[PDB]
Amino acid sequence: EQPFDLAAELAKQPHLLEIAGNLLMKSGPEDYIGAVLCLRGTLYFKKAHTPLVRESLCQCFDEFERLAEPHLTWLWREEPAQGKPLTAYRDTQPLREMMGAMDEDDHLSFCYTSGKKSRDAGAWLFDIYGKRSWQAKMGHDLSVLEFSVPLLYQERQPLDFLQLFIDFARRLEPEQGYAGHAYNLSPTSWDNDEPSEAFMAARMPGLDVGTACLLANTPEFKPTRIKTVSWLTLLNNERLALAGGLDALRAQLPSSHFAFYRYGDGVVIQAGAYPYIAGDAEDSRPAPYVLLNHALKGIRYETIGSLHGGSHDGELRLVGWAADQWLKRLDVEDSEIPRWCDKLLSAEPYLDATNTLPERL
Amino acid sequence: PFDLAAELAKQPHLLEIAGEDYIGAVLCLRGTLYFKKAHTPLVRESLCQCFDEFERLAEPHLTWLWREEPAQGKPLTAYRDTQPLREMMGAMDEDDHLSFCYTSGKKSRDAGAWLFDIYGKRSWQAKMGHDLSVLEFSVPLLYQERQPLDFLQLFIDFARRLEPEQGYAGHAYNLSPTSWDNDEPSEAFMAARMPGLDVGTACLLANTPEFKPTRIKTVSWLTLLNNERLALAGGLDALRAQLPSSHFAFYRYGDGVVIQAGAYPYIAGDAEDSRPAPYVLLNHALKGIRYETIGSLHELRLVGWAADQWLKRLDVEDSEIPRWCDKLLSAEPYLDATNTLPERL
């Protein structure tokens, strides 16, 4: 009596906004929120073990918390030296106070969520995963900041998340990054819920998939390359040069629909007037992402390993060959680019003062 | 739908998916038969005998006849005004494509729960190796509940006449007869939550390169194996010894067998596991003759990869089969004269 309304919803639109925990399993849904569609940004950066970067991370959180304070509910920390792995947001110490108890050899682990239950996925997120000084010196030097706001918040305040992403890039000088639609999964039960993400990924080419903090220091991530484009795409100056330089990119990305934000030592590219889940009735790939992916696929990772854990009892998981194929989901033939340029101009809203920051080039 | 009528009382459109408004899909009991020689006069008469039999049940409910580019008449015809099927077919030759889709949808583009659909390959297509035609037919779920032997009788009778290669019957969504390329299957959801449902459009699968092996796409409530497939699965004796006669019935015809898995068709299992116990046991017995790939069913390669995954949705670990059999024997209704044909082996 319960699968039918979901079968009807899935047949007519690509996405699900909220997904019950363990839904894409044979044992079936459980009494928690396993996944929530939101607007998420992911930044891979270095020197998280240093005081200046930690202070900048705290300034990032101050900026985020001004928006998110009414909604945050839980702080998760991995094996903290003081306190508990799980703390109610009301009971937490200021982030600057917790960082002040740490030195360069401590691991940064802070995940603020907005789920009603601590097990629930929530649409507000601020997640720091910071490598220890000795880990960075032994070669595992890449840290991750991920943060998100709800889709409804984005529609009501269309410049707020974008301003955060640029402000954070400016302070952290990241190696690479992206922002757009993604599912936040349950902080504790995500293994139940990766199949929901995998099912959605096949339907929504604009969706980011996977866990950046697990990807960050794999051998597959060593090349000077990027995982994906999305609504926002961040390239440090080295990746920008490998992509042909800023002049060569602006020649391929019409300024009617693409904006460029030069922060210090890199650029953020905005692909379209808003983030895109999918395309149209003819093609599920978003036209602005297709054009940007075409310009940047020369610097895309050939493989990043598996995006998900292994399958237990027949459930869907983006592993091995399927993960490699996911990386290529936006690729088109060179000969089809003019048609995609035409689709951009005829069907997609233009950039204006309501959906870009004034500091765009 | 523990109590389907009770569920429809609270959600009248529970079995429908909306499609300028039309019914895009309706859940029903559908049989699919893949057979050869549709271009020959002997088989064409057999198809007309099949429709004669279907029409005795469906005549009050059929509304439309769809035909793709007919040499005589129009693509759409009101059912009340159609010619006899034999006379339309009499106007056709070896090399004409058989295309007849009778539906019960209220509007012409509405999916209907009653269906009789012929897709017959041309003689020259058959000679080039694209020789597999499809007959699909369906009745509403509520009709099956009140007349539980009628669809089953049709499926066996049609199998006898057509001597199919392979086939299956059970729950499926009938789609709109003209807007049949606008809604995503959602194969991974079906595999997880409604694993008893068939998924796909048989006439598009029949002559793909993926279908050429001597294999089957799926088990369902009814599963049809020609004798070649039966032998590859280890033979009928061993199947009957492995599958409890309390819950599995076997119907023989001149060229193969139809297996009935359970007292009625199953959408899903129970609260603990969505896989229906009778289908789990039969899938385990037959997975050695299942297609390994099918292509996509009803976009990047991830949608086709999902379709290959859907083929395995009933698989369980071998160590669990004894527990599944105990669950079948203790929890599931058994077969008797109320839900099987008397001709069962």
Side-chain angles (χ1 to χ4, degrees):
Chain A
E1 57 177 309
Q2 289 168 307
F4 303 93
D5 302 295
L6 272 161
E9 187 183 352
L10 292 169
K12 286 168 307 186
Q13 69 179 17
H15 58 288
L16 291 173
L17 304 180
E18 192 177 274
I19 307 178
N22 210 51
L23 174 71
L24 273 291
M25 264 321 242
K26 308 293 185 181
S27 56
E30 288 166 17
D31 196 17
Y32 73 97
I33 302 173
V36 57
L37 188 58
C38 61
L39 172 54
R40 189 171 74 193
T42 302
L43 298 175
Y44 302 81
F45 67 99
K46 297 190 182 184
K47 301 176 107 193
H49 61 277
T50 65
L52 288 182
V53 174
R54 290 174 178 189
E55 298 176 14
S56 285
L57 286 167
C58 288
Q59 175 66 27
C60 293
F61 186 63
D62 286 342
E63 265 198 279
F64 174 81
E65 195 175 45
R66 186 182 61 82
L67 313 183
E69 188 277 336
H71 310 287
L72 294 180
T73 50
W74 306 104
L75 171 64
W76 285 101
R77 294 178 304 156
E78 178 167 11
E79 306 204 337
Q82 300 183 286
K84 296 287 179 44
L86 176 62
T87 309
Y89 175 67
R90 262 190 64 93
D91 301 333
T92 60
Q93 298 176 287
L95 185 58
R96 290 170 199 274
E97 186 76 19
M98 289 182 288
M99 304 227 69
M102 306 177 104
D103 59 23
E104 62 262 20
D105 282 323
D106 288 313
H107 163 61
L108 306 196
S109 180
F110 301 97
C111 183
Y112 294 88
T113 69
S114 61
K116 181 179 170 54
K117 306 198 266 69
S118 63
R119 193 182 185 188
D120 288 339
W124 296 92
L125 171 79
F126 190 93
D127 186 350
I128 298 166
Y129 177 87
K131 308 305 289 177
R132 310 165 186 271
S133 170
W134 63 262
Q135 281 173 337
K137 285 176 225 288
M138 297 301 104
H140 290 193
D141 62 358
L142 195 58
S143 298
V144 174
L145 171 62
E146 292 201 294
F147 71 103
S148 72
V149 304
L151 298 187
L152 183 60
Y153 188 88
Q154 165 65 22
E155 279 177 349
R156 297 172 166 166
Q157 311 291 336
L159 302 185
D160 282 10
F161 175 96
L162 172 59
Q163 188 72 65
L164 295 178
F165 194 83
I166 305 308
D167 284 357
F168 296 180
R170 192 144 43 205
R171 324 204 154 88
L172 300 175
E173 304 208 304
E175 313 287 305
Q176 58 179 301
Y178 41 83
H181 291 94
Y183 282 97
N184 284 338
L185 307 184
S186 166
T188 54
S189 300
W190 42 269
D191 191 64
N192 296 340
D193 299 299
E194 292 185 338
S196 303
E197 180 178 55
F199 170 55
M200 285 300 135
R203 308 150 56 92
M204 305 160 325
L207 179 94
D208 178 55
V209 173
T211 304
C213 66
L214 302 190
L215 297 172
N217 294 288
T218 60
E220 289 91 342
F221 241 58
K222 305 263 201 289
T224 307
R225 296 194 164 209
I226 61 173
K227 177 198 172 186
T228 185
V229 312
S230 195
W231 182 49
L232 312 184
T233 307
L234 185 151
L235 310 178
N236 68 345
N237 277 339
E238 177 165 24
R239 284 166 170 81
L240 178 59
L242 285 165
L246 190 51
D247 290 337
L249 286 180
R250 290 170 77 179
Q252 308 166 252
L253 308 163
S255 57
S256 58
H257 287 74
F258 296 84
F260 302 82
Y261 303 100
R262 263 181 58 236
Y263 68 94
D265 70 310
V267 65
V268 174
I269 305 173
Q270 173 181 344
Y274 40 68
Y276 283 76
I277 291 169
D280 54 25
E282 302 134 17
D283 200 303
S284 64
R285 300 164 288 192
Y289 297 16
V290 164
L291 292 173
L292 182 60
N293 175 85
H294 190 76
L296 297 184
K297 61 187 190 180
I299 63 160
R300 192 177 68 216
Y301 289 109
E302 309 183 60
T303 179
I304 59 178
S306 295
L307 287 160
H308 288 154
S311 182
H312 301 306
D313 194 10
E315 73 274 5
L316 211 70
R317 307 272 186 167
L318 289 174
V319 302
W321 176 92
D324 289 354
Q325 289 297 130
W326 180 85
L327 294 174
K328 312 175 200 289
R329 67 200 185 286
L330 299 167
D331 286 354
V332 299
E333 301 305 325
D334 292 18
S335 56
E336 293 309 297
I337 290 298
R339 179 176 65 74
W340 283 99
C341 302
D342 287 332
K343 197 141 72 143
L344 185 79
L345 304 190
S346 66
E348 303 308 327
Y350 282 51
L351 302 180
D352 60 28
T354 69
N355 54 36
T356 59
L357 306 182
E359 72 191 71
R360 67 174 291 199
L361 291 184
Chain B
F2 179 93
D3 186 316
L4 179 77
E7 288 309 314
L8 290 169
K10 305 126 191 71
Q11 304 97 352
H13 307 287
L14 182 148
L15 300 186
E16 294 164 1
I17 303 176
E20 286 92 352
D21 57 336
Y22 64 103
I23 306 292
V26 58
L27 184 63
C28 62
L29 172 57
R30 186 169 76 200
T32 300
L33 299 173
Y34 300 85
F35 67 97
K36 295 190 181 185
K37 305 318 149 211
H39 63 272
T40 72
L42 283 277
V43 175
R44 298 189 165 182
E45 173 61 23
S46 297
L47 290 163
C48 292
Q49 294 173 291
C50 290
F51 188 58
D52 291 342
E53 205 175 332
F54 178 77
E55 205 169 31
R56 293 186 212 123
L57 307 183
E59 185 270 337
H61 309 282
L62 295 180
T63 50
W64 304 109
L65 174 58
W66 283 100
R67 295 184 295 165
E68 263 178 275
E69 311 195 340
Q72 210 181 38
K74 299 301 170 177
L76 176 63
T77 313
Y79 170 69
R80 278 159 53 86
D81 302 316
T82 51
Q83 295 187 92
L85 182 60
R86 276 174 185 89
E87 308 218 306
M88 294 187 280
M89 302 203 65
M92 268 171 276
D93 73 87
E94 243 197 344
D95 286 312
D96 283 328
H97 164 68
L98 301 187
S99 179
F100 299 89
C101 182
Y102 296 88
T103 73
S104 59
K106 187 174 177 181
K107 310 188 203 62
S108 66
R109 293 182 183 174
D110 273 354
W114 295 89
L115 172 78
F116 191 93
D117 182 346
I118 301 173
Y119 187 94
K121 304 301 295 174
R122 311 176 181 264
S123 187
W124 66 261
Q125 276 167 341
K127 279 168 246 308
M128 213 173 272
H130 300 162
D131 55 2
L132 196 60
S133 298
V134 178
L135 169 64
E136 293 201 298
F137 68 104
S138 73
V139 306
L141 294 184
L142 281 175
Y143 185 89
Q144 162 65 24
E145 283 197 353
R146 65 186 188 256
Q147 308 288 336
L149 301 178
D150 278 3
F151 175 97
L152 176 61
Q153 186 75 64
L154 293 175
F155 192 87
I156 304 306
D157 289 355
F158 296 1
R160 243 193 296 276
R161 298 207 181 87
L162 292 174
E163 308 222 299
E165 313 291 294
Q166 57 177 303
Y168 40 81
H171 290 92
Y173 281 101
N174 275 347
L175 307 182
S176 171
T178 64
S179 31
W180 52 284
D181 185 78
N182 238 73
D183 285 340
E184 308 135 309
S186 312
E187 314 100 60
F189 179 80
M190 309 293 258
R193 287 286 88 207
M194 306 171 80
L197 260 73
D198 182 49
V199 136
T201 297
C203 63
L204 288 189
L205 297 169
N207 294 286
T208 59
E210 287 86 353
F211 257 30
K212 286 299 202 275
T214 309
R215 296 178 171 265
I216 64 173
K217 173 194 172 187
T218 186
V219 312
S220 194
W221 184 44
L222 311 181
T223 307
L224 184 152
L225 309 181
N226 68 346
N227 278 339
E228 186 170 16
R229 283 163 173 81
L230 186 53
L232 290 162
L236 185 60
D237 279 357
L239 285 180
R240 299 172 62 200
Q242 173 186 6
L243 298 165
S245 66
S246 55
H247 290 81
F248 296 87
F250 300 84
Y251 305 100
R252 186 136 52 190
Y253 59 99
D255 191 22
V257 70
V258 173
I259 306 174
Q260 172 183 346
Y264 39 69
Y266 286 71
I267 290 173
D270 55 20
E272 312 306 320
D273 198 297
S274 65
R275 296 164 284 202
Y279 297 15
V280 166
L281 294 185
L282 184 63
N283 175 87
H284 183 76
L286 297 184
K287 60 184 187 177
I289 62 162
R290 190 174 70 214
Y291 290 115
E292 308 190 50
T293 176
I294 184 159
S296 64
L297 279 163
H298 302 195
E299 61 278 356
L300 184 81
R301 305 302 180 178
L302 282 193
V303 298
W305 165 80
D308 290 355
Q309 292 291 288
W310 176 89
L311 296 172
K312 311 172 185 174
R313 72 204 178 282
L314 297 172
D315 291 352
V316 298
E317 278 314 321
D318 293 19
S319 59
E320 292 298 300
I321 289 292
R323 183 178 62 76
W324 278 97
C325 196
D326 283 339
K327 186 156 82 154
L328 176 83
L329 297 180
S330 65
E332 294 307 318
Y334 65 98
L335 297 185
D336 63 12
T338 73
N339 53 31
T340 61
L341 303 184
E343 71 158 83
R344 70 174 294 193
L345 301 184

